[PDB]
Amino acid sequence: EFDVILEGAGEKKIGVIKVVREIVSGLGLKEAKDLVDSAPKPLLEKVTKEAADDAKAKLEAAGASVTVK
Amino acid sequence: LIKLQIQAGQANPAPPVGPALGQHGVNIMEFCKAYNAATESQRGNVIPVEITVYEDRSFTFALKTPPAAKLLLKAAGVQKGSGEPHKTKVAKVTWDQVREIAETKKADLNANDIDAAAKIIAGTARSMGITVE
Amino acid sequence: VTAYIPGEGHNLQEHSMVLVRGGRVKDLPGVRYKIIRGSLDTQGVKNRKQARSRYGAKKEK
Amino acid sequence: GSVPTAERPAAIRNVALVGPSGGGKTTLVEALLVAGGVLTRPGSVADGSTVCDFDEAEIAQQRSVSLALASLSHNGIKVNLIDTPGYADFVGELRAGLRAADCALFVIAANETIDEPTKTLWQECNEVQMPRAVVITKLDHPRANYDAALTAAQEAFGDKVAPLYFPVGDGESCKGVVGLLTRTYYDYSGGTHTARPPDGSHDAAIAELRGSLIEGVIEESEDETLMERYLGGEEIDEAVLIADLEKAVARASFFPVIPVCSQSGVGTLELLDIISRGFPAPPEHQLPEVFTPQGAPRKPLSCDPDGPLLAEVVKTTSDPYVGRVSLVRVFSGTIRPDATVHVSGHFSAFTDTSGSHGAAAAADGSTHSHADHDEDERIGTLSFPLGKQQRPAPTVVAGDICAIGRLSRAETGDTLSDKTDPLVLRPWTMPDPLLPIAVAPRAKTDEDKLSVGLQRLAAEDPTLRIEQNPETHQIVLWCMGEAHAAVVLDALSRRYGVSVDTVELRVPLRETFAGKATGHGRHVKQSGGHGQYAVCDIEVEPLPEGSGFEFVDKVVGGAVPRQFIPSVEKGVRAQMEKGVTGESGYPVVDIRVTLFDGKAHSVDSSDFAFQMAGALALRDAAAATKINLLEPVDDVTIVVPDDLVGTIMGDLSGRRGRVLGTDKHDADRTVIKAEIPEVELVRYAIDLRSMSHGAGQFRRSFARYEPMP
Numbered sequence A: 001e002f003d004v005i006l007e008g009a010g011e012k013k014i015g016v017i018k019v020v021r022e023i024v025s026g027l028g029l030k031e032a033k034d035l036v037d038s039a040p041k042p043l044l045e046k047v048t049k050e051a052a053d054d055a056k057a058k059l060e061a062a063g064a065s066v067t068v069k
Numbered sequence B: 001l002i003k004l005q006i007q008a009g010q011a012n013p014a015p016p017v018g019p020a021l022g023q024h025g026v027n028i029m030e031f032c033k034a035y036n037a038a039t040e041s042q043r044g045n046v047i048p049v050e051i052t053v054y055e056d057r058s059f060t061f062a063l064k065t066p067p068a069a070k071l072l073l074k075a076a077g078v079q080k081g082s083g084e085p086h087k088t089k090v091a092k093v094t095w096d097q098v099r100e101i102a103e104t105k106k107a108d109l110n111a112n113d114i115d116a117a118a119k120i121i122a123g124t125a126r127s128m129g130i131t132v133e
Numbered sequence C: 001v002t003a004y005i006p007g008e009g010h011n012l013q014e015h016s017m018v019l020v021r022g023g024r025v026k027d028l029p030g031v032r033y034k035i036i037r038g039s040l041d042t043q044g045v046k047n048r049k050q051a052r053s054r055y056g057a058k059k060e061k
Numbered sequence D: 001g002s003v004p005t006a007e008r009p010a011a012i013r014n015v016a017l018v019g020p021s022g023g024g025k026t027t028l029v030e031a032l033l034v035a036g037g038v039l040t041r042p043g044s045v046a047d048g049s050t051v052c053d054f055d056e057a058e059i060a061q062q063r064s065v066s067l068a069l070a071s072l073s074h075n076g077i078k079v080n081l082i083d084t085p086g087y088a089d090f091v092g093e094l095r096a097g098l099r100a101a102d103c104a105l106f107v108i109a110a111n112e113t114i115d116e117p118t119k120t121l122w123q124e125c126n127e128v129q130m131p132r133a134v135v136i137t138k139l140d141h142p143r144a145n146y147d148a149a150l151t152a153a154q155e156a157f158g159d160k161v162a163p164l165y166f167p168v169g170d171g172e173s174c175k176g177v178v179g180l181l182t183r184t185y186y187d188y189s190g191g192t193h194t195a196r197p198p199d200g201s202h203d204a205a206i207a208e209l210r211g212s213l214i215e216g217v218i219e220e221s222e223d224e225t226l227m228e229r230y231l232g233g234e235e236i237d238e239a240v241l242i243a244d245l246e247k248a249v250a251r252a253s254f255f256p257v258i259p260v261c262s263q264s265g266v267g268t269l270e271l272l273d274i275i276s277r278g279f280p281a282p283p284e285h286q287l288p289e290v291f292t293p294q295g296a297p298r299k300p301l302s303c304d305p306d307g308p309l310l311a312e313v314v315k316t317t318s319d320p321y322v323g324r325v326s327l328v329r330v331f332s333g334t335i336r337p338d339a340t341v342h343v344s345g346h347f348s349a350f351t352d353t354s355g356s357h358g359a360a361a362a363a364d365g366s367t368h369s370h371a372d373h374d375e376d377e378r379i380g381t382l383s384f385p386l387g388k389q390q391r392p393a394p395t396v397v398a399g400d401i402c403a404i405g406r407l408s409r410a411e412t413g414d415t416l417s418d419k420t421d422p423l424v425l426r427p428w429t430m431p432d433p434l435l436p437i438a439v440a441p442r443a444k445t446d447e448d449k450l451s452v453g454l455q456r457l458a459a460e461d462p463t464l465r466i467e468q469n470p471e472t473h474q475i476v477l478w479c480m481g482e483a484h485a486a487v488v489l490d491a492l493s494r495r496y497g498v499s500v501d502t503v504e505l506r507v508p509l510r511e512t513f514a515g516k517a518t519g520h521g522r523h524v525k526q527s528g529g530h531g532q533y534a535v536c537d538i539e540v541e542p543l544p545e546g547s548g549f550e551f552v553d554k555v556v557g558g559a560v561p562r563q564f565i566p567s568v569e570k571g572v573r574a575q576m577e578k579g580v581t582g583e584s585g586y587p588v589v590d591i592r593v594t595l596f597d598g599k600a601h602s603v604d605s606s607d608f609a610f611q612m613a614g615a616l617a618l619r620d621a622a623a624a625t626k627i628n629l630l631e632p633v634d635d636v637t638i639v640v641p642d643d644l645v646g647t648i649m650g651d652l653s654g655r656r657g658r659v660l661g662t663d664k665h666d667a668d669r670t671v672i673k674a675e676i677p678e679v680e681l682v683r684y685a686i687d688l689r690s691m692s693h694g695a696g697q698f699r700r701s702f703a704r705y706e707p708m709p
């Protein structure tokens, strides 16, 4: 049971939004754009450790500042 | 707060899980996929699941050991239990299978010693009409 | 009146609109009229190719 | 009033107003037209002075059972007010109304909440991709709560539903509404529409509503940066916000909430502005796909009068003097007086998919079963339907909905286009009636005109499936319920003057045996010279269902010349057809015969003697043994929530419904399969609507026959 929290966007905003859409289904360019802008929504909850750290690696590769315990 | 016994290899059943899961706000699809993954890793027999609920509608699944009745059925090699227990015997089990199921029930149960689970499974075999030897 | 229905196949079921015509048939002693094929509810007979106009069947394509 | 005139589809709106039974759509349309100058004063169906509720049955039952069209062009944009019935028994009328329009409006009550039939209506209106704008009415009632209805709408159909105008009033006689995007409250304390900036009583609440609406609209809008600018310290430009709202409506993804005081005219002008600006244009609207005659794909026609011709007839009327006036749903091309178009009957092969027992494709009419037709006709008189009156118009541009009089072949859904390039617009979902009711024609002229009357009815209501049973030669009418059957009977006894006699529905039954039996057939008939003496012995046993009729001949010695055995078989078949259950038998099916003895004479007995011998032999065999009466069983599709599972399937114990599985559609809805003989399915519609409280539908499919117990 892990909750993923994203802290910023950076210089790679488009890639961050795309990868955020890839991680969790149901978000568009605009909804996830607003989410990473601020809109603090806890996207995924109680996910497994492998999902958490793969999302961490993908988001960091996208230029996003994410924290995974 | 409900519990069910359901086949391992298939999710979204018609009779047992559907309506009871539905009237509790549990997401059907996510539970189905997670249970199917766990039961494809298991691949032994059907598994019983307990449903625990929260106020935030999040669902947690509790997966126990394979049912003792089903384990005795596979150990005796027969599929359907005896229609007249203690009056007609369909199969016989040696103590190796009974003790393996006793270790299973030790892992899943409150029993302090394997002998307690062995006598539990012997009682189950009596209930089915299956001799323990 | 009783009217004969020419052709091999007729769609007519009980109490449907038709168009009767004069005509004699020996085999039926009391029949004096014929039903025109291809008018009102009556359908021109199917698979008909020769002497088509008598049976109300359209030309093939 | 003045005729609404538009010369471009983007200046035309096609709105099929939808709502529950007791929706007040007719009064709302009257108020909208009174605002637009079509009517001087608004009428009420209670008085009977309305426009849409012109039919006799609408006044008779005090609720809209037949659709109507009202035309009104304000601010240069033509708005077509298509009122639609809300009753469950007229789902096809509303389906056709949607299919002949580019927009839909949900008009509900503020003092009453949403019931399951209206939930099903919203579900269907979703799977057509129609932008639905929520209209809150019945504000005059003391129990009216716009906020409660809006909260329930935002809870049920997602948070995407966002209010556009927020009313300000006492809750009984509301004094007006607030313009959120426009920052302008419209007061009616004097009875006149005064667009003014709000005094500031709820200025914080006004700002909250504006921000919520902006986030709901911008998040769907193309420009991602709009929300960032709004949150960055800049107030978004009003024109940009209005354009975003129009575009969001155009995607059929946004559901604005527009409360209207239909009792006092408050909310009418703003709703008209909403229609004029936010509604998608028919060229931008997703037109129904257009089929070539043989099924090859074709791009949908451009919604332009300059483009190729395209239209569709979706209604039909009647008149003593003038004739038939049929509505036309024009998608493309220019309609001009005294022109020739193509009248296509859906090319019923497209709608030939299944159809239950009757295989209803389009317009039925067993004499001309399925539409499937191609007709080229000169058009009659152009007109715009305004209740019983029809306003003529010189030209019909693309996207507009018109009605032509003096027609003969026009039927509901008949695609109209150029006769050189004929077209079949995709037929909408056609609901099969599931309540077969038998009738009998009192006189000959009654049924002789009944064919024409039912063809006209299908031209008005294709949901009426008709299939005349050939076995008992009694016409059988299928309906959706008491409302549909009542409307059909009223129109039949009034619109064409046909006297009717309702009779019990007849269902057939067969004969099969229970075990092996032997039969003896003797023929003796004095003739004087060459004998007439036949003694046949047979042996008949039952056969499994579908195994047909098996005949075996085992005459020892060959006393019967071989040309007489077919006469024996013919007599056996005749006895099977007449029946063997006592003296009032039924056609025997699925039995095997073994004729193992015979005798003959050649000169006299050609066929009849051995036919009678075989009939007596089969009578002797079947009387000695047992027999069975076979009735049919069908597969039943039942989808009810988890709570109605027990309430239904326990009653099926008294209704002999054997369950096979309670498949889980999702959380609550559960798919139930059971095989029930058609005996119990005679009145299941009313019973179902009773037990499920108007929240139950079913399907029926014939499976096989079963012995009767």
Ligand SMILES: Nc1nc2c(ncn2[C@@H]2O[C@H](COP(=O)(O)OP(=O)(O)NP(=O)(O)O)[C@@H](O)[C@H]2O)c(=O)[nH]1
Binding pocket: D019, D020, D021, D022, D023, D024, D025, D026, D027, D044, D045, D046, D053, D062, D063, D064, D083, D084, D085, D086, D137, D138, D139, D140, D141, D262, D263
């Ligand atoms: N008390 C009250 N009666 C209303 C209201 N709106 C309509 N009615 C009543 O309902 C009848 C016609 O209105 P309504 O049912 O909404 O329109 P309809 O065309 O008959 N039905 P539908 O809305 O489904 O098309 C009349 O008897 C009228 O008095 C309302 O807000 N309050």
